Structure formats: C-alpha cells, structure tokens
Design a protein around this nucleic acid. Structure first.
Lengths: 177, 36, 62, 199, 240, 164
RNA sequence: ACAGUUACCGUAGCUGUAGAUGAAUGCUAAUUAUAGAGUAUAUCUCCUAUGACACUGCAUAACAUAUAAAUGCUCCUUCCGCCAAAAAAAA
RNA sequence: GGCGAGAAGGGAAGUGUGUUUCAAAGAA
RNA sequence: GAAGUUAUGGUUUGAAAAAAAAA
RNA sequence: UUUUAUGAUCCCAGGCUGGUUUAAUAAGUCAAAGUUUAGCCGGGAAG
RNA sequence: AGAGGCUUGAUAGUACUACCGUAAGUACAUAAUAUACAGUCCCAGCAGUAGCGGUUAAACUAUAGAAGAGUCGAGUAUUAUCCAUACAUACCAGGCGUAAAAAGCGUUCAUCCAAAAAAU
RNA sequence: UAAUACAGGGUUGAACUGUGGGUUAGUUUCAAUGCCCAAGGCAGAGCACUGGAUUGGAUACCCAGGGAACUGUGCUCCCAUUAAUAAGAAUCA
RNA sequence: UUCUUUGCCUGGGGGUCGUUCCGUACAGUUGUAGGUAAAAGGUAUGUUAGAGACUUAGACUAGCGUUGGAGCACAUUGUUUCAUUCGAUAGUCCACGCUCAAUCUUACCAUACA
RNA sequence: UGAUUGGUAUUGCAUGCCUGGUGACUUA
RNA sequence: AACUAGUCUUAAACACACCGCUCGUCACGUAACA
RNA sequence: CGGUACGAAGUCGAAACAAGGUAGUUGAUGGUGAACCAGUGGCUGAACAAAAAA
C-alpha cells in the first residue's frame, strides 16, 4: 500500500489561516500600544505564536502602506510563485472551511514524542540508532557525556551610521582580558 | 611465468639463453655452473 | 576463483527454522492468509524445538 | 586477502604485484599526450576492410611532426588529399582498417570539409550556410489552419463582437467561403516581434 | 554537471517508450505532469454555462478537495475517540497493584506533571465515566464544600491519531475466462514513481527554458491538433 | 547498506520494484554482479544469500538475553508489565486480603494521580465549555465552532458551491 | 555500477555510461534588451481583483582562483626611490 | 652625505631538499 | 641551531675499498 | 680495517610543503599518493 | 524560434547536499509525431566491443522529412590528460587442480611470525 | 627386491631433555634421457644410411642389414623435472 | 570467507663497454614496435567415429522368377538440322511431366498479316 | 450451340497450393 | 562373418554438425623490429 | 641477412581432432620441399584387449 496515491491534508500558515479581520484587529492593537498589547499578550489572548503575530503585523502594515499610498492593489504587488500558490491555497481553504475566528496554535510548544523527519530518529553525536545494553539489577557505569562545541562567534560592540565594529571571539583562548 | 613460460614454450629462450645442459644447437656455458 | 571452498563461511547456511506456528503467525500478521481455525490451538500448544534435541545425540565407542 | 602483505618487505613487494593491463588510450600513443598533431601525407590510397565487411576505405600514411609515420583514416565522403599534403590528425580508431588508430580533422590545413553535408556539421567542419540561417528564421512564420470547430465557435460566440485588422466590425456570421480570422494580438506574435525588432 | 545527458535517457515518470506506449521515444519528459500524482485540492469549472445568469453554477469542488481541506472535531471523530479512550485506559483502569504503579502506568499512557499539559484523568479532582459510580476521593475525610469535579481534557496523541485516520481511510457475470492472464499481477516502475516523488530525478534544466517550453507548447499544441484534424476532415470531404 | 530511518529505499530504478517486492526499508541496495556469461542466474543466489543475513532486534535480543533498544521506541520488545499487577479480586476475597495485609502510608509523590477505575465510553467535547476566564472573543469563536461541528448539515458533501 | 559480448555455468579481457580537468579543434553568439498598454475580441469565475491567463533570464545587470615552455638574430640598460632634519625659506 | 634596492632567482644538491618533533637571554 | 625521517623509474648485468705482496 | 642483498661500489631523471567547501548514514580532520596567490630553501668574483 | 550545438538503431536509471508520498503550469486552451517517407545497394558510407549496408534501411545521406522528436543551452560538440566509475593498483578489495600462476626434490643464513597476546 | 659389508629413514618402548620452531638467499648436496668429454667396443637391440615392398609419390608406417646413443664420485639440470594441487597451525571420536 | 612464511600471475600473442672478468668471454634478458575482441575451462544435448556391444526388425540365406547375353518398343545420351521446344538428372532422372503428339495438342523453326 | 482484360519470358534461392525420400506419432 | 534401421556405451578440437574441423612450405603485396 | 605481423586466397600434400586410419605430445638430438619422420627417455593433455581357485 506504500504505492497507493493517497491525498493528504495541505499545510497552511497560521497567519494565513486566521481571519483577516482578526489580523487587522491585532495590527491595530500592536501599532497603537505595543507595550500593553505586547506580542506575547496578543498571542496569549488569540491563541497564536509570537512569530505568527509578528508576521501578521508585518504583512498587514505592508498591505496598508501600499493601499494608503496608492502604490499597488492587493492584486498588483509582484510576488513569487510560491507566495501566489500560498494565496491560492488559503483562498480555497477559506472557500471550503472558512477562516478561523481564533488562533489554534500553542504559545510554548511541548516535549512530545513525534516523528519529525529522519534526523529525529537517531542520536547524531553517538552515531547510533540502537542502544545495545546488558540486563542487570544493579547500577551500570555512566555514559560519557558530550562537551559543547566551542565555536567562534562575532558580537557587535560599536555600530554607528558609518562604521560597524564587532569583536571576534574564540572561546578556546584561555587568557581573556 | 605466464609471459615467461609463453616465451619458453614459443622457444625464444631456447635460442637466446645459454644452457649448461648444452646441446648441439643451444648456446653453451664456459663457466662453472651454479643455480641462479 | 573457486566455489565451495569457504569453510566456516558461505558453504553453510545459518538460517532459522520457522515451524508452523511461526509461519502462520507471520502470514496472518502480514495479511496474506485468513486466520485458520486450528491456529489458536497450535499457538496454545507450540511445537517443540527438535533441532536442539537432535544436537544432543553423541557418538559412543563400542 | 592479506596474504600479499606478509613479511617485512611488503611495502616494496606488493606494489609491484598489481594489474598490468594496457593503458586506456594507448591506441593513440603516437600523439605523445597531445590533442592532435600535424603531419605530411606520404601515401594516399584505398584499403580493403577486414571481412565480413566489404568496400574501400580511404586511408593515408602520414608522417607526423614527431617524425613517426602512422596510418590515418579520412572520414567523410570524398577528399582531395594527395602526397605532400599537410593534415591535422586526432585520435580515432577505424575498426575496419587493420592497424588504423588515427583520423584526420576535416576543414583544417589542406583537408577540405565534407561537401553536401547538413548534419553533424561540427564533426566535419561545415559552417552554417546563409540559406540555412535565413530559413531558420523564415521557418517560424506560423501558418493559419482551421478545423470547423473554430468556425462553429466563431459563429456562436465571437462574430457578435469582432473587430477586423483595420478595426471594422462584423455584421454577420462567417459565410461558407470565409476563413476564420486570425487574432490580431496573438497570431504569429513571435515572428512579428522579431521582424519589428529588426525593423 | 554540464552538457546533454550522455547515456541512457529514461522517462522520469517510469513509463516505457515504444510504438504503442505512452512515449514514442526516449526522454525525461519532466513537463508531462499528467504522468505523476498531482492532487486536485481546488475547484473545477466547465467550458459552458447553460444558465442565463452567471451564477457560478458550473464551479464545483474536486473529489480530492475533501481530503485536502478536511474538518476535524466531527461527531464520528468524537465517537471514535470515546471508544478508543475507553480501550486505551483499560490498562490503568484494571490495574490492581497500587497507587504507585497506577500513576506510573497513567504517566506512560499520557505523560504529565509540573509544567506539562495532561488530561488530568488520574487526578482525584477530575470526573471520569466510571461504570460503577464511587466516591470521588473514609467518611471522616471528604470535601465539606461543594467543589464539583472538573472535566477531563482529551488525550492529544490519541485524538490526533483518530483525526488523522481519515487521510488513511480508503473508499451474475458474463462467464468469459481469461487464459492470457497473470497469476500475481505485476509491479512496474511507473506505479512507484507516480506517487513516491522522492524517487524521481531532479532536473538540471534551467527554469527559464522550462517556462519557455511551456510558452511554446501553449502556442504549438493547438496547431498540431488542427493539423491532424484537418487531415481527417479533408479525407472525409474527399470521400464524400 | 542501512540508511537513516525516514529516507526509505535507494537503488537503481531498474531494480527499485524488486526492492519494494522484497519489502526492505531504509537502506540502499547495490549490485556489482558477475562479469561471466550469466547475469541473473547467479545474482539471484547472491541476493538470496544476502537476504538470509538480515536479522531483527527481536531475534538478537532473544538470542542474547540483553537489550537492543531502538531509540524511537525504548522498551518496545523487552518491557513486560507483570500479570501480577492486573489480578482482579472478588468482594469477599478483597475483604480477606485487606484484613491479612499490612497497610502502608500513601506517598503523595508516588501516589498522586491514582483515582481511576473501570471506564465506559462517553463522548465529550471540552473544547467549547464556557468558563469565566475565557475571553469574549474566545467564547464567541468556540460557540460558533461547536454549533458548526454538532450541526445536522455536516457530512453533507455537495460538489457544487451554488446548488441547483 | 548498470547494461552488452550469439545454448548454459565459470575464468578473462573488451565496449558504453560518472567524476577532475579546461589544454587544442569544429559550429555558434556577443556589445544585452529599444519601447510601455487599456479594451489585448471568446469562455468561466463571491481571494472581485485588467482573477483564471499565458512575449519581458528585461537590471543598481554581471563578468572569477592558480600559470607566461624551447632555439636564433637585433636592440635597451649608464640621470633607481626618499631625505637639505644631506647647516634650510632662518620670528 | 644618510638609508633602501636580486626584473623577486628553480642555474647546485638523493639520502639531498624539505617535512615532523624540539630548543634558543641580555643587564652574566 | 639539533633529532627522526620506506625511496621511485630507466629490465639490470654484487661485491667495493684499504691493507699485504709485486717489481 | 671499513661498507655491503635492510641494496655497499656505482650511471641517467626529477627542490620539498600547505590550500577551509567537498552531496552518499563515504566521516569529527576528504582518509595510501592528484592544487592554485603562499611557506622553507636555492655559492662566489672590479684583484 | 525569444539560439545554437549534439543526438534522432538496441544498451547505460539518467545520481547524490534542504525537503524525503503531506503536492496543484490542477482544470480549459489541449492533442500528437518518425521501426511515415525519400536517395544508395556489401557501393557510397556509418559505428563504441557487438555490428549495419546484398536494390522496400527506425543503423548510410537528407529536417520545407513538418510550426517533427530527446537533452543541454550562451553554449555545445570532438580530441587529449587521469588515482581513466568495482579494465577494484585488489589493506578495505583479485588469483595459482582443470581456465595465468607452487620453484625438480631438499639443507641452511638474514628477515618474518609462533609459543607467557595488552602491560611490564 | 637371496646372503654379506657400510650407512640412513620409518615404526614401537625406556631413559634423557625442557619452546630448543614454522618458513627460508648474497646458499649449495643430489637429480631421466639427450648433447660435449672420457671409457670401452662387437650378448641383445638400434638414429643416419643402404636395398626389398605399398603408394601418382613418398625422404614413413612394413621387411633385411646397420661403425650414432645403451653401465662414468665428469660436464652436468633443459623438461608433460620425479608421491600428486608448496610448507606449517586449527577445526573431527 | 581462521592464522604464519616463501615462490609465481595480470586477456591473447609477437619481435627483441655492466666488467683494472679470461671478450666470438663472464654476468644478464617476460615486458617499449607490429596485430588483436577475443581466447580459453566445464555440463547438456545432437552429429560423427576406417570404436564397441546388442535386438534379430529388416537384410542375407532358402524358394518362385528377373535383368547384364539376342530382337523389338519407350525414354535418355551422342550426332545432325532453320528448328528437331522445354523440364526431370544417385538414392528421389531415364514407358518420368507427356493417363498415349499423323492434323490440333506445340510451348521449336520457316513464311507473311496485325 | 451463353469465349475472352497479353506473355509456356527469367526467378522453385521469394512464396501459396501439391508431391518424392528419410524420421517420428507411447498414457494412462 | 559382414550391411541398413534403430537402440545402448565410450571419444571428440565436430555444432552450417566428417561433403566437419584443421597443419605447413612455396607464391603474393603493406609494414615493424633487426 | 635470417626470422615476424597483417590482406589475399593460388599450387603441393593431409600433420592434428574418432584407435584421425603409424596414439598424442615433451627434453636434447639425427634426417627430410612442406606439414613432418626415426631412435631414446619422459608424461597422459591416449586408446585396444583384459584373470574366479588351485
């Protein structure tokens, strides 16, 4: 049956699933009082994620800027093929089921055992999919823990309208001063 | 031995190689004989 | 090259002996055969492991 | 499988015991690792291919710039090579002719390109003729064809509001002696665009 | 890589080529998407609308759209979840070892605890659909106030399984015996490459030239159609 | 050769159907094949001998007596909840056992979340139960959703948006 | 790592196909995109939108890492770069 | 009078060139 | 500045010096 | 007395070293040996 | 065709980096062409080992042979170079009955390995 | 391959001994016939050659005769070169 | 594809001053040109065997008659002619096609009409 | 007492039909 | 004691199948090495 | 020079493959237009024929 051409549900962004009027309401609240109507608070009230709220606000601000400046209509902004297909997907989703009147996401996702691709099925550090172990009723030697990789990073320290200065950090250098 | 025995079989060595075994047509050895 | 010169290797075949209960359980689980009526009785009275008992025969000097 | 690295002198013995097959492209050893060499035709003739094949193969013995003399096949139909003719020679094996391992590059030196050739032109040094270039443009002057479904649909939907090339409007469906008109903004668009861009 | 493919060129769909095959010659034919699985998640209209008013009466949902855009929370979903919840709680329900092992089994079945969102099924302050009613939790200790037990929330994993089962749901005689028949059917490569997309070849062609090919087709296919149809019509006229 | 769980089958498209028939998964299959007169007559024996090598975690664990645990399913094959856990008892014997046994204080940490008994199916829908803390918009949306879900017009498939 | 090599199996070569070059040759292009519509004729269609839909790789265009073989003849090299704080223009 | 200046070397060298592992203080 | 550092190809054609003696 | 089949005696040919990315459960250092700005070195003479 | 180069007898899975059946260039426009045909006849010629051509060729020549077909594309093809795809340079990773390969039988030096491996 | 003389190796046992070995070139004892050399030299048989036949024909097969070779502590190891497909350890009662 | 150590092989196949060493000698020699897509091991059938065995089925043998010896007829061959039409050519051609030719049959030749 | 669409020219090594010779034709 | 048809065994480098396969000198041109 | 590889098939025989019509082939030889022949010693990569016991 692995060769059966099954049809699976299509995935759509939450910021495109929620109703446009809810998007406008969120944009109004954020553009009015970003302190009282924080991104976290808006997501908490409307069952969305902070990233989703940010995307909603950005998209609505762009659309409103274009409309009020009379630069382009909602059907004349040049976009990519992927975004055109996404617009079609949401149009058919609304025509079939209708826009959601409230968010259904979770603010802080949970530690749930789910398959999330082949990368999720193995211990990359150990380079093993199977933990072979002996049977005993007494403690066994502990496993050697990995040590976090010490990789270089750049941290900006002074930025102006002309010059950007950032410190190149080597976490292995013992003498720090 | 493959190409070497092929040369032996086709007879190039029989002509061009000295033999302490002598014979009336093969080249002879005028020095004391030893395994090489 | 050669053929059956691999002693302690591919000369022998190390394959499991699957009896009626094992084969029928596999067939039913994979859905290639409808569950026979005798299968429950066979499972509740599994066949013995005859190869292990066979390995117990020992040659004796006369 | 590790019986060949026994002892102390493995690092010198085993590297000697390896395959000794001929090089992949030893058939063209007289080019001296070069893409091609110039040579002088010392002899020009026709040879008989090995059986079962029959016919005559056009061949020449050519003295390369390196001084070696080799057998070279003359690919194509017809040639003008004679003795004391300079030819560029590349690696190519003509299986029919015994011992022939090199070919002659057409259109270089005194070896003229094959005549009356229109396919595989780059393999015989034939340029794209002006007639061919002109036809590769005049070929895509699209032709107008109808299947009477166009007539049905035009008389059912289009004739009601239709505009002629000059802008004239229609007042009656298509007659029996009138072809379906072309679409003024879609028919022959590519060829018309190219012509107008040219001038 | 660069240049044309040197070697064997096979259709990416997996269909054979021949005189009476879907393809006449060798090729990749990556533009021919009719030979691969493209679900219809949208609507469909007709060439003509018989009605005198443009009411959009020809527009209709595609069959695959009902699986593309599903709706969850339906009554059969609820019923299936109820039955499966009963069966799935059977173990903790019939455990008779002790509170410790009962809690262990309950946590294994539905992980929960501080900082976690569980169903609260095992909590003493949550209502369950017991067969034989008993004290919520002898007379000395109880809750002197009303304090009704709170409802139990669903098990998210099981509910998701129940909801997703829909995507995997699948929808005398003229006695002429076949002698030129196959005993065990056959499994060609096309049956796999039609729907298992990851097995197909990724194109090295420029998207510019892919789009150009589409644009050329949109203008040339009708001409070939009319060429053959005109041949047939001219032959019929000559016969007439 | 094994592949990570999720990649599936890899091989020459000429023999991918053979892989699907064999039923292998998460692996790449390569044939280097004979260069003698035969091609598949001896390759069939080679493939059979290869397939005979495959073992399973259950086979290895049963043979050895040790743990061979897949990380995406620990304890799948060796974990066994004893039947001494689920031994039901009658009322009279329950009284006798409560009399004979010595009581043990209930530990809250290990004892909490243990108030369950035999269950029967019942349909619930706690996604739309109004509460004081629910916001007005949340209440409105949940009410509309519950009406839609419990409506009698559900399961009504109409291919046409504008019905006759 | 797949196929082919005239009954079948095994040796054994051979043939095509990958990759790294980017060195010579054949055919081919080049000064890179002037210009800016409306009714583009029909059918269909509650994202109503010049939507489906269909000439603009079309732009602030871009254009990269390693190299410089051999023989003969003729000519050229001579005022190299800075410092007068190399005691200078000098209250 | 003072500093700098090899058209940026492939003309020698096989157990060599270079590589790897080390070491190198004035004001004693 | 020091200490360690498998040789390869041209098919290669095993003993080389010193010392002794000689005149 | 000193070398020498662990290649003495003794011809011809060649300075050595580094270069980050690098697909495939072929990588945690590209994995016997393949490089590209570069590193180290490569006499003396107005007698 | 916004464009050319190569293929247009069989034969090679056309790889491969994120995604790993979770989708629409989905529907209409919109259905196909070449083992059709023409010139030559063991000639001219082609081709990669095999091979094709014997006067009706999907194998040579011809693409107004049709707005033909496959791939790449401002490029593309031929030749050449290799650590020349597992012509496993065979340590991973080949052989020595019969198909290449056990020295004519033996005594030994040096090396190599064994028996108190790893450690000392 | 009878006896005798001089030497091995194998098998069986007792004692001794105590990892003392497996393989082996810059090694060399032996090794069919032929050829070179030396010996002898006509018991037999027998190349080349002679002549008696068959064959279009034979320089052969058949017959008669035949001075080459048939016994060596020499020269000496070419081979379809000698108990096999190299020697040793392990797996078996 | 258990381990140790020597010897040898790389498709087939071809040609071929180093010595203060006694030199037409010693030592040493598989390898470079020219050809090549094969070559070669086995099992399975068939065919053949100046190989063998067997049934005794036919053949022999035995019995009744022939033919080669003479005459005639048919066909064929050789010859000849303007033409004496043509095919058939060991078994499986030769009283065969032609189970019957003075005319016709006639398909051969000559003449003159289209 | 009811005529007709050339060739007894080559090619049986293009064939159909038809013959000669030799082989076979075994099951429950 | 012989022959044909079989039938059986053995050998084979035959498989277009003994009217098979197959060796060489000489003659004949194109070449490499020497 | 003698030998060697390719194309062609011409003259002369019939050396091998069956017991190939004298088994084959091998070491070093002798002889011969050609394949080859003869002796001697090797092998099988050869055949034929092939025992009762008094």
């Amino acid at each position: 049956d692995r060769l059966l051409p099954r049809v699976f549900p299509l995935k759509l962004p939450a910021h495109r699933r929620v109703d446009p009027l809810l998007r406008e309401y969120i944009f109004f609240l954020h553009s009015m009082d970003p302190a009282r109507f924080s991104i976290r608070k808006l997501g908490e009230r409307y069952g969305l994620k902070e990233r989703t709220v940010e995307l909603i606000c950005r998209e609505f601000s762009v659309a409103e800027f274009l409309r009020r400046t009379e630069l382009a209509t909602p059907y004349t902004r040049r976009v990519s093929r992927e975004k055109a297909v996404l617009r079609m997907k949401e149009a058919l989703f609304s025509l079939k089921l209708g826009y959601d009147q409230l968010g259904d996401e979770d603010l802080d996702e949970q530690e749930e055992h789910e398959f999330r691709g082949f990368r999720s099925t193995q211990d990359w550090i150990q380079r093993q999919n199977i933990e072979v172990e002996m049977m005993s009723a007494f403690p066994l030697p502990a496993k050697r823990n990995p040590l976090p990789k010490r990789v270089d990073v750049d941290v900006t320290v002074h930025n102006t309208s002309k010059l950007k200065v950032m410190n190149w950090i080597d976490p292995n250098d013992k003498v720090v001063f | 031995c493959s190409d070497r025995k092929r040369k032996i079989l086709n007879g190039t060595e029989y002509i061009r190689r000295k033999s302490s075994h002598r014979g009336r047509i093969k080249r002879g050895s005028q020095a004391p004989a030893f395994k090489r | 090259g050669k053929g059956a010169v691999h002693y302690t290797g591919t000369n022998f075949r190390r394959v499991q002996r699957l009896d009626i209960v094992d084969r029928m359980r596999a067939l039913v689980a994979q859905g290639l055969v409808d569950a026979p009526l005798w299968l429950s009785a066979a499972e509740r009275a599994p066949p013995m492991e005859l190869s292990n008992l066979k390995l117990m025969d020992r040659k004796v000097h006369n | 499988s590790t019986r060949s690295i026994s002892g102390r002198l493995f690092y010198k013995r085993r590297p000697l015991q390896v395959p000794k097959l001929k090089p992949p492209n030893i058939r063209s050893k007289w080019l001296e690792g070069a893409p091609q060499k110039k040579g002088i035709c010392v002899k020009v003739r026709v040879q008989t291919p090995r059986k079962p094949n029959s016919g005559l193969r056009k061949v020449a013995r050519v003295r390369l710039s390196t001084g070696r003399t080799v057998l070279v096949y003359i690919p194509g139909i017809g040639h003008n090579l004679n003795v004391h003719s300079v030819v560029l020679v590349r690696g190519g094996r003509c299986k029919d002719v015994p011992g022939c391992n090199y070919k002659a590059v057409r259109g270089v030196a005194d070896l003229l390109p094959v005549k009356n050739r229109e396919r595989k032109r780059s393999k015989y040094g034939v340029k794209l003729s002006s007639e061919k270039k002109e036809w590769r443009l005049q070929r895509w002057n699209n032709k107008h064809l109808t299947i009477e479904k166009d007539r049905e649909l035009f008389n059912q939907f289009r004739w009601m509001t239709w505009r002629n090339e000059e802008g004239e409007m229609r007042t009656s469906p298509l007659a029996d002696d009138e072809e379906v008109p072309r679409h003024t903004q879609l028919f022959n668009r590519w060829y018309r665009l190219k012509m107008q861009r040219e001038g | 890589p660069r240049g044309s493919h040197r070697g064997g060129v096979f259709p990416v769909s997996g269909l054979t080529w021949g005189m009476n095959r879907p393809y006449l010659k060798r090729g990749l034919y990556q533009h021919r998407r009719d030979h691969i699985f493209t679900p219809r998640w949208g609507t469909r209209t007709a060439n003509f609308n018989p009605s005198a008013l443009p009411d959009g009466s020809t527009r209709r949902w595609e069959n695959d759209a009902f699986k593309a855009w599903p709706l969850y929370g339906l009554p059969h979903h609820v019923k299936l979840y109820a039955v499966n919840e009963a069966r799935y709680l059977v173990p903790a329900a019939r455990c008779t070892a002790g509170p410790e092992i009962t809690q262990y089994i309950l946590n294994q079945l539905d992980p929960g605890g501080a900082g976690r969102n569980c169903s609260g099924i095992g909590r003493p302050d949550v209502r369950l659909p017991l067969a034989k009613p008993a004290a919520p939790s002898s007379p000395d200790v109880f809750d002197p106030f009303g304090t009704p037990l709170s409802e139990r929330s669903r098990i998210k994993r099981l509910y998701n399984l129940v909801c997703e089962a829909d995507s995997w749901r699948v929808k005398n005689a003229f006695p002429f015996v076949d002698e030129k028949a196959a005993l065990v059917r056959d499994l060609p490569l096309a049956e796999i490459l039609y729907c298992r997309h990851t097995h197909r070849l990724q194109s090295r062609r420029h998207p510019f030239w892919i789009d150009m090919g589409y644009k050329k087709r949109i203008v040339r296919i009708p001409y070939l159609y009319r060429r053959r149809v005109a041949k047939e019509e001219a032959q019929e006229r000559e016969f007439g | 050769v094994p592949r990570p769980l999720g990649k599936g089958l890899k091989s020459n498209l000429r023999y991918l159907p053979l892989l699907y028939l064999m039923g292998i998964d998460n692996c790449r299959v390569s044939f280097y094949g004979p260069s003698a007169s035969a091609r598949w007559f001896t390759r069939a024996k080679a493939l059979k001998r290869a397939l005979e090598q495959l073992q399973s975690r259950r086979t290895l664990a049963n043979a050895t007596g040790q743990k061979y645990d897949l990380l995406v399913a620990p304890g799948e094959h060796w974990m066994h909840w004893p039947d001494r856990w689920f031994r039901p008892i009658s009322t009279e014997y329950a009284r006798m056992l409560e009399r004979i046994k010595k009581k043990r204080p209930p530990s809250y940490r290990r004892g909490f979340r243990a108030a369950i008994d035999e269950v029967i199916p019942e349909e619930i829908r706690p996604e739309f139960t109004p509460y004081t803390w629910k916001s007005p918009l949340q209440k409105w949306a949940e009410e509309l959703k519950r009406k839609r879900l419990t409506s009698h017009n559900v399961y009504e498939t109409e291919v046409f948006l504008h019905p006759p």
